[model samples]
Target: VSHEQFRAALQLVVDPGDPRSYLDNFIKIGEGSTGIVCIATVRSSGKLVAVKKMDLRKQQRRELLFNEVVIMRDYQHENVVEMYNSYLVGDELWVVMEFLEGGALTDIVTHTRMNEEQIAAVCLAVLQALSVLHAQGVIHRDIKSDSILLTHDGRVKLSDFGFCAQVSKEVPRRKSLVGTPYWMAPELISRLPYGPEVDIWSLGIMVIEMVDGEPPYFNEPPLKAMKMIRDNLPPRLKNLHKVSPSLKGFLDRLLVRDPAQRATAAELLKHPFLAKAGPPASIVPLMRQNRT
Candidate 1:
């Protein structure tokens, strides 16, 4: 079937024809190994939406993409990017989602220097997502600046669940060693069976990236970067002194070498650093002007 029906788009009105009939003016936004993502206006409602179109015949089997669809359908949370619908057309799969005008957290991190208030606020939002996912026995195997998105009003969202894994009694923790090398926890690098705590470690790296301008060894080669994580090498933190005591404590708890010792998202939610975080709107002023 070509241009097939969509699921979970109850309130979204879509024309039952080719994608172009419902999606208008597709503008390239960003892409990943799986597909190209674009921004378009919904013809029926005139609302902005993000469309991710991936070929089914590529090296990544349809089964792999099916995993992403399953996760997107089962879990619904505010901190996660909401998926509007999915379409299977010819040999391609298209996923429509809400469009965030503020762009990726990487844009904010790269373009502007964030104060501790902004950084902690971001951490709280991300940890909120990780908290819910962890409670449901899910591991966001890939957590990085790139996976975090933002709205023009400065609300943080966690996206890109393509590499997410579910934990069951039969497979309690993941040992697949999948993730962006720089943000991979030491346990993951050493082939240990890791659990949800890994996401906390990744968040710690993101925090450092926000304050220090980049994750540790961000400029190193891929292999070297993985090696650094494996060796438990410390990041050369340039702006650590500028952060508050609670912020330092939060990072300390997050970046612990032992996975068992790493902070959990649920626990991090009540962290003093985040408790001191400025209001959600604290980031609004900081975002109005973006990178050139």
Candidate 2:
């Protein structure tokens, strides 16, 4: 469908409003391929909110844009970001989400190394989000470290649902080339129909990222990375000696090559590795350190 059709359909979805009236102080913070993310202030409440402004006219995948809005609005979870407001202003779609001061998890992992306790805390919250998503028949096709956001107190939340896909009775499995190449499940890159297990595989890669500061084949080309994944060569932890037996067991369950052998998010949540998770406050120092 054309842009006009999307605009017309959205008329029923969201009320048209001029953001200038209610929101102010737009500080350019970041940008994705399709939109610019700004930190904005609410005029009435004086609350800070994260705004992702996307130019609909410039987008090539209009349907994906629509799906993103639908999922974020309809699905509400504590571990998933809260969508405060959305506005359709001309060709620009402003999605206002909860402002996360800690920013992306990748930043913290890259700048400062995390111990097993801290990593388990982060993984616990992410697994909570994924458990809900999987139970709802949705696959957060993208589960990299960059997609995970943190709060000042070290709470973890999953973001970036643009690649999320829902499964229904008729569509039990998904077959598509989406998400980052390095984080893809073997089934996904091998062109096999995949279920929510694909998300678990990506989460496994994120564990490697948090432990080693980067997923395996991260520096390689996308094609080479996918080749490694499809070849059934799962990435190993860089510092295996440093990892506890609990964490190693957890990773073994997660990085299983066969989806049938992989543990689901719910099962992973009950794993003994998560018993090592300290209080959320354990990572507060790391979050503050990344306040750049």
Candidate 3:
């Protein structure tokens, strides 16, 4: 769907409360390709819940945002963010979910790059999350630092299911304008029928970004880099020369041009990197206050 259609569709949803709605109780928490996320405290249980307000005015983004909630509900797992409920109130799709207190890895890498060990830990959590989704026939068409949220407690909470969908054995490929330009796989940019391999390709990009402190296409303008992505040569990790050979080799394998050649989520679990991997404490804080 076109971007404009998505914006218009999202504008139709209504707010949950009364005329003065009083969103003062709600605080913005996350942003995605199609919607804005907020945190609202449940007074009765003192539990913080995440509420995603869909941008339904845009038909494409609205459909994608709604699918995100549906996909999350279909594949329930401990590692995955749990979806509590969803409904259309006014021109907004209200998605209630578990609250997490950390920001995206995009924020983390902005301050300090991940060490090889931390990268391994991140791989464990993220790939494990992927494994859960892939096992349920869902492919996270978009996988990136921004899409993966690190909870205040250091656990990985994969948010933004906006570009995800289920696969099938017969024709297990996706058909949609999916993923961020920087993180998408070559085949995806070429408009090929793709599947979980797309996510694997993105994981490779994430690994490289973890070590290099930025995306491979960080230098190029978005449009130019998109052309490169479609050409099947997004960016190599030349900047990550200081990284270990073993880690670099793994990243290379994950980003291989041959989708079939890329590593599987379960296969990534067996890699030597996670042998001594454990969650990072300082990384996961339980909560955060968004600054205006």
Task: For each candidate, give its TM-score against the true structure.
Answer: 0.89, 0.94, 0.85
For candidate 1, the TM-score is 0.89
**Reference-based lDDT, each prediction:** 0.79, 0.85, 0.72
Best by lDDT: 2
Q: Cα miss at 11, model 2 (Å)?
A: 3.1
Q: For every model in order, what is the number of clashing pairs?
A: 0, 0, 31
lDDT of 2 by residue, 1-292 (tens): 5788888776667656767788899998887546888998999998888988888887767666766677766788888988876778887788888998788888887888899999999899999988988998999888998889888888889988877788989999999888889899999998899999999989889999988999998889999989988895678988888888888899999999989999999999899899889987888888746445
The C-alpha local distance difference test score for the whole of candidate 2 amounts to 0.85
Candidate 3 whole-model C-alpha lDDT, 0 to 1: 0.72
Where is model 1 more than 4 Å wrong at Cα?
A: 1-18, 59-62, 288-292
Off by over 4 Å in 3: 1-24, 232-234, 282-292
RMSD to truth, every model: 4.3, 1.8, 4.4
**Model 2 stretches astray by more than 4 angstroms:** 288-292
